[PDB]
């Protein structure tokens, strides 16, 4: 699958710093 495919929200991004920034909102 894509490098960082986060299902919790449904989205994939090749950058970790970007997905990590969203993890701070994953309440």
Residue ranges in contact with Zn ion by CB under 5 A: 6, 8-9
Size of the chain in residues: 27
Nearer to Zn ion (CB atom), residue 9 or residue 21: 9
| 6 closest CA partner among 21, 19, 17, 15 | 19
Interrupted after residues, the chain (C–N over 2.5 Å): none
- CB of 7 vs Zn ion, minimal distance in Å: 7
- CB of 9 vs Zn ion, minimal distance in Å: 4
Nearer to Zn ion (CB atom), residue 2 or residue 8: 8
């Amino acid at each position: 699958a894509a490098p960082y495919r986060c299902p919790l929200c449904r989205a994939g991004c090749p950058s970790l710093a970007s997905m990590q920034a969203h993890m701070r909102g994953h309440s």
